[model samples]
Target: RPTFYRQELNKTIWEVPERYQNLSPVGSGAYGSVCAAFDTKTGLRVAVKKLSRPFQSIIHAKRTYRELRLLKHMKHENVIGLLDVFTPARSLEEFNDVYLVTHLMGADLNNIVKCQKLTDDHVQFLIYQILRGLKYIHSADIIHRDLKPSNLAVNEDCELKILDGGLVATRWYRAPEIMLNWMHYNQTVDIWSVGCIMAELLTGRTLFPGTDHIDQLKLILRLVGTPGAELLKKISSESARNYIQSLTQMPKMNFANVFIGANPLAVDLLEKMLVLDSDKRITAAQALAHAYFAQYHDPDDEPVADPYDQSFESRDLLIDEWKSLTYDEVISFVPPP
Candidate 1:
């Protein structure tokens, strides 16, 4: 059996298990409020996030359910670990809030990239780990539509863990196919963000620093060149295809020039990673095998997960079903001491 108690902080209510102590605010986002706490039982510092009124709408509820399901199923070194989950209410009748406990990390990659000066060795290890993480995720048949510096949490030792799983990259980091509103986008979208992140890591500035949505496409095309008419035919959105076709004809910028002083192998990898056509972009597994990561790449050590079962995502779950499914997930979680 599990026990929970409630405490209110700054107009928000936290109903959490008593094993956690020394709770204090750390961060907050659209999804929930986070607090740093000491796990008296495990003697570890954990981040506890309380979902913000999930049951308020079906969209929120579905998102809450998907997040919980994915977090529990996801297990990778470069991916954030889910330590535990619980609801204040034991039964679904009173269950309106959910608490998620995860290993606490220092600043996210966004802040680190802004302030820290990383050496080549540092950049190599970091990029290798990001690809490694993506390989594991894509292997599970899941597309982490969101991949950016802010979602990538890091420790002082340079160990990185991707934090946010449910979403999309902000406009600057978004893939071209997404901007063109393709009928469907694939895992290649994540690869595009990796390319942007790789460039940022090397140059200490965003590769495509767009001011707005249209500007995003212009920035990308200005460097990579506009997509060919053949490729434009594949775009699912008629308006998007026309809009892109109307853009000025431009030649692809030389990576060697753009990423001056970067390794030749690094330049080569970037060329493949940042392809305008999603189908032509490098896959995570393929990217790991590239020469850029040769020194650190070890196939034996690179693990893959069993494909995830996403059948549930197809169903239009009612609020009751969402509550019941999420409740079951909460009760089943067990934290290691």
Candidate 2:
């Protein structure tokens, strides 16, 4: 039976299935937690995400339900798959709990970028896969507000999969319109993030390494230049104006010139994706069709060198250590400064 609780549950650890007993914990997040477990029945490894109780508000519950609904409908190689869901037995002492089951893969794009120096061809391949995934998601009217390197994973076979739907995206990768709190932003938001990701892939660092929201705005303006007056009109809110003005004083730096040794085609695509007018930003599908990636071939055709092997080992070690720690103890392991 489904465990339905009215409020947050206390710290309570449930036993993994006997087959999964030796499994380790990988990561944790705002809503719940995830562990790496093996399925005895299939002899496959999986990531198990446990959903915590929803907040007291009905709105929060509905949002949680929406996440589940959305995940079930999203099916693509570049998107994470939802394999199974379980609801723990309800008891008065414990709040209702749910677990989301998914396949385990290698490191996310953030770590992938950090650990490797990518060739233009490799970047093109990754860009193509990302756009293909975005096209599929947009067709279903699903907007992945949070598209960042950390939320994207590469499988052992070198396939890409976008992960995590609990939040729109991390702040650094968020689009300007979202920072402005525009309610109607759509799939184009993902394009903005893709641009940021592409830039990072080329330079092996963040495009906008802002310390806060204001610093983030400054970073964007520095790279893309300030939005035009007409574009500013569209961002009609006072909050948006305040933020925009705060960014106006920052000197502009053309990204093309900033990435000194990067390929021109890559830079061209980055410019299209980072257009100030959100409507003008290139669609993921359009990006795939862009001349920038016209020459890209599947890595399977010519397997590039593997850069993630060492990072994978490091991640495995971190997960093993985390499994023994309490929830509070695990939170301290968040990405460092």
Candidate 3:
């Protein structure tokens, strides 16, 4: 609504309130670019993302609105909460971009995992935070859909937050159900990604590095092995079922061997999280309560949210509709307490 800090960066006009200053490039992605900045009002470092070409297409339009709406409602220590929203453009005609701000974290888990040797304590706490955050997300009827090292932000103190709760997907951490093209999937898919991330943290390598979707499923089967007949019977897609049935059945691999030198409890938790059958997979709440997090688990400290307005998710609005909806969200946004 107000513009105190305006600058041209990478050919994009950044119009933010004076509360945010000292903008420095952090990173850029296809959808937008992020900068680390100082929030004078809070005296804390924050990250500001400028959505690039937000309304260039219906796909981009829907995503921008989805993320804005979702992040505004997300308020938890382990989940990146929206701190501010603004746009340099005052009118709908001039509103080509949107700015979202969140607290800045030092690095993502990908960078940390690659550069540092994490201990059992670190791994346990990190995974605990993930499930802790996912628990809240699931309670609100949101599936992070994408939960990987890059999307997980961590600070020097080992504090972690699930970042980019926006709607998206990544290949490596994708659940088998999704890769199998199952028509109906749920929040448990996020649990599968967490299991993959937990394995990566333990071994410093991707659990399934498939070249493509087909290979992805093959790689997963190579480790987790074929699903039981019960799960097979539940496959809604005939082709998916036929594909699995045609494959050479393999027995599940031992987690002890897969994650060498990892804690037994952690391995046990990983096994449950990585279950092929979504029906059998351990949910975020259950994973948090697992023995692996017994030292850090506190039911009272863990929280859930009232169901979110998922009605918007099913709608296929036009660009004009999405823009109007997004503007409405941006205009009435309130910072969480």
Candidate 4:
């Protein structure tokens, strides 16, 4: 089993740079452990993610490839960047772990929600940054697939950065179509998560805190009501479609009823973003233009993409193939220590 800490901050680990010291474990990622450390080279604190068993499964391989590729290729201010990546071994069989470095955040949105009271201005400012990030990733036809409160990093200055992109979405913040396994879902899935994060911010808790896959759907239905038949046509799981129909349609609750003291425009924006019909859900650009953010809307502000890697149309991405691909990318990007 993977332990979740540095026994001694000054003690040595496998192979972090000599200039990087004062390692203290902070949190855990989906597949790895995170450490907060000092970078004497840059003279700023940074977070280092040590990917565990990067080749443990096909799923892990695919996610590792997607994340590293995206991190290297996407260079927006709102998206996390890849500072450096390294490994202990030089060969495929010998490689067992991977470390990635990036800018550090003092706290995640989830913790901030629990402890802080966000004013209307704070919510509007933060949501705009999230939309800015979404607009960047969606422009490349890439669905972040994973967006949740914890995946969003925030600082006291109200700057927010979207983090942790992969195939999986956290159950609590998963989109309706994703929970139903809709094969053709798109960027709207992330928009849905952004909506959930918004609601959590206003209410100071998760909008739908589901315990499992099925229960998650029930929670969504209980609050948002069953989707209309047109949207139901998209559900891939016949059993899920039937289960949804078998239950009584819920009466959608007004935002004022759920989040006290929230502005009307904020409530309206959430309603648009959280539409059960993914097709009906608003786009990031549209959300950015909503009345809720009218004060901060900049018509000339357009989404831009920075040079990032991409996968060719098709290839034999077999097991451990991600290892070879990423290994080469890391070597070229950052020479081994």
Candidate 5:
């Protein structure tokens, strides 16, 4: 049986175990906060996510447990590792916050892209890694609804890891079907996020960095065009439709043209990944086997020799490796940055 943290309500600071004493704040979210801490025994870095409140409804508790259960079953280099879970020394009233410990990544994919401009080959490699991760996750019937650059991180080695579960990704990388409140959303949602991430990587900026939820939908509409009548019919909630209607002008632009000088093949893959219809979107597995990569990528192909192992180094090298990573050059790769 799992032991939960118990404490009274309305307390701001909770006492964590000695193991978590040197807690360094990393990031925070609506439901909890993330901290980086050192494991005294192993001297390894770990991420500890402390929830704001204990599970109230059975449904919320189930979801929290489910995330842990899923993490336990998943073991991949590209996926964040679950180390341990514990209760804080203090709690708030009926609510007790739980902590999930996992490996700490150097920086997320977003930070890397922000620091450097990726080439066509670099983009392909990234897509390959992401597809591999998604393939494994989807095989288990787990849909990572949120797939974005920020959620995807790279280690000291350039290996990519997808962090943050589907529960958190709903706001940014969510699919149209999910926005419509479709009862059944599957792996396609993951693919949608993959497409968005890929586009951002190739262009070096967010494909759709919306100001709010309404703007997010509008951004999607601008690229993919408005949802058709049949697609609109699926949205059962009146509020959803009303919100969708507010966006009157749906811009039609070719993504390939949007990013000038981008590889045509890379753009082709992006188009398929960001397809308007969820059913039409390609799966991560299918994308992995796509001709674009099949024709371009050489598995035995070695990266150019460098003092630092390009394989393990950060994406920041993209600037030094490719001469002239000026602000203009960087913005050119990902315009509107």
Candidate 6:
């Protein structure tokens, strides 16, 4: 066993379940690496994300537990499903790495958007699916908190699934509430990001491509205009509120002018999605019904009640509790067909 190695992933070896094979490294990040492979037992090509190290830092540890907890519970066609969860460790002391298996998507929306290949139908269906997914998430009172092009997965058939709910969105798509450090935010934050992505789909560039947090806010203001005192007071920190007041009031740019030859309905939808005030933003359910998607809306498609238990919402577990919980949860998980 010591001499065994996955040929495609020669640098590292994983003590994985016997059901998966042809594992090969496809991507890497600060947290861990993801490998693409075939699941021999299930007969599905899948993507597996291997976490680098947990229990190394408090933040890292919590992230590891939360991702495992949320993915275990969230189940929907438009949301990425966790097909399997495995860790090679046999005991608490041995645990550091974790693996998440999901259906392998053809490409992320980031790649698609970069390739500049979206059509009207592509725009219509992609946004519709995202809103549909968000409807489910908001219904459960869970904020995706991160909904950028990179986190969105899509296939050739035009099916889309929302993935990666572990952190803040990539800077370009972050909402005003998050940038201002507002004390509270609701599901509308996600709708704001959807607006950003919608604009990107039409324009082939991030609606607000800021270099840093401060720059990000300015980029948003140039298009959305300055928020008033009432909205500024929503900022929990005195410093953030003061910073907003210090800035000059900027006028809102005309959507037609900014979007440039975009469909009137599409631009109209973007305005609603990208409102400066979170309270003023449209809900995902409302966005799905907008005129832009009137032709695409399936009137008979009633959303089902979320099947997973959300009682864990109010129960805040500490580090050790999270540790025991994830460990217990992983071992018992068996992916559905």
Compare the candidates by lDDT and give the number of the best one.
3
| lDDT, residue 319, candidate 3 | 97
Worst 10 residues of 2 by lDDT: 303-312
RMSD of each: 2.1, 11.8, 2.3, 5.0, 15.2, 3.6
Q: Write the per-residue lDDT of candidate 5 for residues 86-146, one digit (tens) a residue.
A: 5533322322446667777657776778788987777877778778777767766667777
Q: For each candidate in the order shown, give its overall lDDT on alpha carbons.
A: 0.83, 0.66, 0.85, 0.77, 0.64, 0.78
Error of 3 at 311 (Å): 0.8
Stretches of candidate 1 above 4 Å error?
165-169, 236-239, 334-337
Candidate ordering by TM-score (highest first): 1, 3, 6, 4, 2, 5
Residue-pair clashes per prediction, in order, are: 0, 4, 0, 1, 6, 0
Expressed as tens digits, the lDDT of each residue in 68-113 for candidate 2 is 5555556667788677655443332343445667787657776666
- Tens-place lDDT digits, model 1, residues 1-337: 5577678877687777789888888867538888899999889898888888887777888888888988888788988768898876757788888888888775788777788777777788888999898899899889887788888877898988876642123887888878766656789999999999988999988899898888898889889988877887677677777777785687688889999898788889999999988888999999999988888999998899878888889989788888788888888875553
Q: Can you write out model 4's per-residue Cα lDDT over 81-182, one digit (the tens) per residue?
A: 778777666677777667888877777777677788888889898889999988988887778877887788888888988887320238988997778776
- Which window of 10 residues has the lowest lDDT sum in candidate 3? 162-171
The digit string of per-residue lDDT tens for model 3 on 1-337 reads 4556678876667777888888988767426888899988888898888888889989999998988988888889999889889887677777777988887776788878998888999999999999999999999988888888888888888999998732123799998877866777889999999988988888888889988898888888889888888777787788777888787788788878888799999899888888887878999888888888989999999999978997988989899999998989888998865
The list of candidate 4 runs beyond 4 A from truth reads 1-12, 56-59, 88-97, 165-169, 233-238, 306-320, 334-337
TM-score: model 4 vs. ground truth: 0.83
- Alpha-carbon shift of residue 124 in model 6 (angstroms): 0.7
Q: Which tens-of-lDDT digit does each residue in 1-337 have in candidate 6?
A: 1122333364556666767778877767426777788988778888777777665665666677777877886688888878888887778666666888888775878877786667877899999999988888788778888898878888888788888732124888888878766666788989988999999899887788898998898888888777766776566677766766677777689999988777789999998988888878899888888989987887567373365455655565676666776788787886786
What are the runs in model 5 whose C-alpha is more than 4 Å off?
1-35, 56-60, 86-98, 165-172, 211-215, 226-252, 295-337
The C-alpha stretches of model 3 lying farther than 4 A from their native spots are 1-5, 91-93, 165-169, 236-239
Q: Give the higher-lDDT candidate: 5 or 6.
A: 6
- Candidate 4, residue 130: the lDDT equals 91
Decoy 1 TM-score against native:
0.94
